[PDB]
Design a protein around this nucleic acid. Structure first.
Length: 57
DNA sequence: ATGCGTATCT
DNA sequence: TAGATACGCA
């Protein structure tokens, strides 16, 4: 129920999955499927990817 | 029906 | 600042 905390370990797995897939295929559902984290939703990944893209600009 | 991207909210 | 929610539109 409490908001998801993106721990350095969880963010690292996100970064590795986003690096594995290219920019084209690094979409929230494919990231989530590859990350393989229990209880992690498409919306959790989508929100994180938005902030990640803003940080890379 | 599904899910991505942007804006907006807490 | 980070993470959640809303929604337009592919």
């Amino acid at each position: 129920r409490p908001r998801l905390v993106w721990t350095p370990q969880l963010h690292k797995r996100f970064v590795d999955v986003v690096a594995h897939l290219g920019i084209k295929n690094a979409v929230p559902k494919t990231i989530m499927q590859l990350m393989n984290v229990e209880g992690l939703t498409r919306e959790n990944v989508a929100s994180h990817l938005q902030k990640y893209r803003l940080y890379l600009k």
